[PDB]
Design a binder for this molecule. Structure first.
Ligand SMILES: O[C@H]1[C@H](O)[C@@H](O)[C@H](O)[C@@H](O)[C@H]1O
Ligand SMILES: O[C@H]1[C@H](O)[C@@H](O)[C@H](O)[C@@H](O)[C@H]1O
Length: 305
């Protein structure tokens, strides 16, 4: 009997798959695709991960914050705002497909958001392109969750990607926010909004411009709410990440190196409490002598069965 965080490649397999994904404490990666950046000056503000998708997944990351730009009427490139990340969306999809084959009792939650203006030559909306060339593309048949449950369990989603829709209104009908209203997302804020035709209450802390100390308080205030809430119809998404700023090199990495351990320590002190889904920069990046945020999120899940 070892800690779940001792097997991060297949920790969701150790859970009771009757759980709703909402009741699982899931580590996510912010701006997941940005691991390919090498330029040092650009990486200060634009790079948020050093591991690739398969290595994030092996370290136990199950929520991926994929940001896209429409490069052609049939193509979505992964971006951080203006910055091209050097791979297209099919790349993440192939990695997830492969990972889910090898670890069939895990599920992956994929947040999809438009992060920059489409190429000139594009004539289609980003949502249409995603819908027709990825979600409904026969090439990724069976890969996505296509159920009609607004609050799906681990059993119904494992081995599949569940869409977390940050595209706005969509004609896709499966996954979080998959309706023609989409998710009302407040800018730089802690907020709450109903999604899936009012079936779920989404509670978000996404104050991405906060400085160190304010950010930690914002993450801790939403952690304290999740701890008292056992309602499976509430979903918590808590971003520990922040935009860079302070000196020429107060990078996203520097913020993560302070935020991650502090929040990791707090979750460890809390024991088995519900945390929600915590989305972090530099997932899996450890520092000698400090607690590891991804491991602490994983271990905060209480087993009983
Ligand atoms: O860069 C910010 C930050 O990455 C937030 O986490 C994301 O929710 C915002 O929409 C984005 O503009
Ligand atoms: O990915 C990182 C990186 O390789 C660091 O150099 C190492 O010191 C960390 O502990 C590791 O988590």
């Amino acid at each position: 009997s070892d800690s779940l965080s001792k097997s991060p490649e297949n920790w969701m397999s150790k859970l009771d798959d009757g759980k709703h994904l909402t009741e699982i404490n899931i580590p996510g990666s912010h701006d997941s695709g940005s691991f390919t950046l090498k330029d040092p000056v650009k990486s200060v503000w634009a790079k948020t991960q050093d591991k690739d998708y398969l290595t994030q997944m092996k370290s136990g990351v199950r929520f991926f914050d994929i940001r896209g730009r429409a490069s052609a009427d049939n193509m979505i490139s992964v971006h951080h705002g203006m910055v091209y990340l050097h791979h297209e969306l099919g790349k993440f999809l192939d990695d997830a497909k492969y990972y889910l084959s090898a670890y069939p009792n895990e599920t992956i939650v994929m947040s999809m958001k438009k992060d920059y203006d489409s190429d000139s030559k594009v004539t289609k909306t980003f949502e249409e392109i995603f819908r027709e060339y990825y979600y409904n593309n026969p090439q990724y048949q069976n890969l996505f969750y296509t159920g009609s449950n607004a609050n799906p369990t681990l059993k119904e989603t494992k081995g599949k990607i569940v869409l977390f829709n940050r595209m706005g209104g969509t004609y896709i009908k499966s996954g979080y926010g998959a309706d023609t209203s989409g998710i009302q997302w407040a800018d730089n804020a802690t907020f709450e909004t109903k999604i899936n035709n009012g079936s779920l209450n989404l509670k978000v802390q996404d104050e991405y411009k906060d400085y160190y100390d304010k950010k930690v308080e914002a993450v801790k205030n939403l952690l304290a709410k999740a701890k008292t809430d056992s309602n499976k119809d509430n979903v918590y998404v808590n971003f520990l990440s922040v935009a860079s700023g302070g000196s020429a090199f107060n990078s996203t990495y520097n913020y993560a190196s302070y935020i991650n351990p502090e929040i990791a320590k707090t979750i460890k002190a809390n024991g088995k409490a519900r945390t929600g889904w915590l989305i972090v920069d530099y997932a899996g990046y450890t520092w000698p002598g400090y607690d590891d945020i991804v491991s602490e999120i994983i271990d905060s899940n209480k087993l009983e069965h």
